[PDB]
Amino acid sequence: SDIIVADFWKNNEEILTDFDKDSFCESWTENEMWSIEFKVAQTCYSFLDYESSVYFRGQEFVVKQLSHDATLSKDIRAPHIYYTCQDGRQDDAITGSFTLEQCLTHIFKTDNRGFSWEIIDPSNILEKVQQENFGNNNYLTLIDQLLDDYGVVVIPDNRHLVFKPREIYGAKTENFIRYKYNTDEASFDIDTLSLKTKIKGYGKVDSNGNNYFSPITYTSPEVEKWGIRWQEPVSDERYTVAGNMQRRLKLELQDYPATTGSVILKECEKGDYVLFIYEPLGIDYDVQIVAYKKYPFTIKAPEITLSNNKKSIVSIMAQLAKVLKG
């Protein structure tokens, strides 16, 4: 449980001591942020400043924000080392039918900046995507594109990046929520504003205005419950053949009420599933762990965010704003 701090130049390293244990917070939100924040009061080299590394439970975080007030007090915000990949650019672009492996190779070919990667896909879920000018961006933006293109998640262990198809990210647990109303341990925002039961996927349109392939349709089994309601189609001008489009549609269709909540659950479990039972209507569906907030040096339980909201993290935060406002 010792925290280690090193200056950017790695000449001063020590155990961090003068920090507020109740301040100390580790926070993660799926594909948005992973950071630690804490407050230190002091009473003589530099160990903790901009660009210092802070080592906590086997992971490295780098000081990017730091306040100075005066004894003296500093409030640190340190994003996980993963986020430093944004310092890298791949200006070169490639076009063609490529695997995730070929794309990741493209990102890091000229300067890997200490990053490595692997793809875990033993069932061969993934397939090629037709890239057009893949590149000309910073490494993080490029990775984020791949996540969307291939239907994968990235799980950083320091600068080693593990990519997995969404299907094998998170396992079914034995946790479940029988939801009748909000409690101390579980509060949810639920709506049907985005409830849809059928969606189309369209590829490229030729110079004559004709489609390369007939659009793909994906229909939820909940079409029986709610009737046909059309989600905005996926339209991807790069696809001249269906490719992974069908799976893309199923990944995107919001065929259950958008449900986002903050819970205390009864280990690391990013992406793990909890069965959500919406009791008033007897409708059962999975919600996933999409965020956490830990105070590891206190007796507080981790605060977990569970969601099935496929739209966006901003849509998820809107729902949580309603949860917090009450």
Name the residues that contact a copy of itself, by CB under 8 A.
8, 46, 49-51, 63-70, 72, 87-89, 91, 138, 179-182, 188-193, 195-196, 200, 202, 215, 226, 229-230, 232-233, 257, 280-281, 322, 326
Q: Where are the alpha helices (DSSP H) in the chain?
A: 100-108, 139-150, 223-226, 245-252, 313-325
196 vs 247 by CB, closer to a copy of itself:
196
CB 311 within 8 A of CB 258: yes
166 vs 229 by CB, closer to a copy of itself:
229
How many C-alpha atoms does 24 have within 13 Å on its Cβ side?
17
**Minimum distance between the CB of residue 233 and a copy of itself, rounded to whole angstroms?**
7
155/142 Cα distance (integer angstroms): 15
150 vs 188 by CB, closer to a copy of itself:
188
**Minimum distance between the CB of residue 265 and a copy of itself, rounded to whole angstroms?**
20
**Minimum distance between the CB of residue 80 and a copy of itself, rounded to whole angstroms?**
14
**Minimum distance between the CB of residue 279 and a copy of itself, rounded to whole angstroms?**
9
Two tokens, residue 260: 């986002």
69 vs 167 by CB, closer to a copy of itself:
69
CB 99 within 8 A of CB 142: no
CB 304 within 8 A of CB 291: yes
Q: Which amino acid is at 243?
A: G
Pick from 79, 72, 67, 69: nearest CA to 25? 79
**Minimum distance between the CB of residue 1 and a copy of itself, rounded to whole angstroms?**
27
Helix (H) or strand (E) holding 175: strand 172-179
152 vs 258 by CB, closer to a copy of itself:
258
Q: For the chain, how big is the Rg over CA atoms in Å?
A: 22
**Minimum distance between the CB of residue 282 and a copy of itself, rounded to whole angstroms?**
9
175/185 Cα distance (integer angstroms): 13
138 vs 173 by CB, closer to a copy of itself:
138
165 vs 259 by CB, closer to a copy of itself:
259
55/51 Cα distance (integer angstroms): 13
**Minimum distance between the CB of residue 50 and a copy of itself, rounded to whole angstroms?**
4
List, in sequence order, every residue forming a beta bridge with 305; answer none if it has no partner.
262, 291
Contacts of 311 (CB under 8 A, 6+ apart): 194, 254, 258
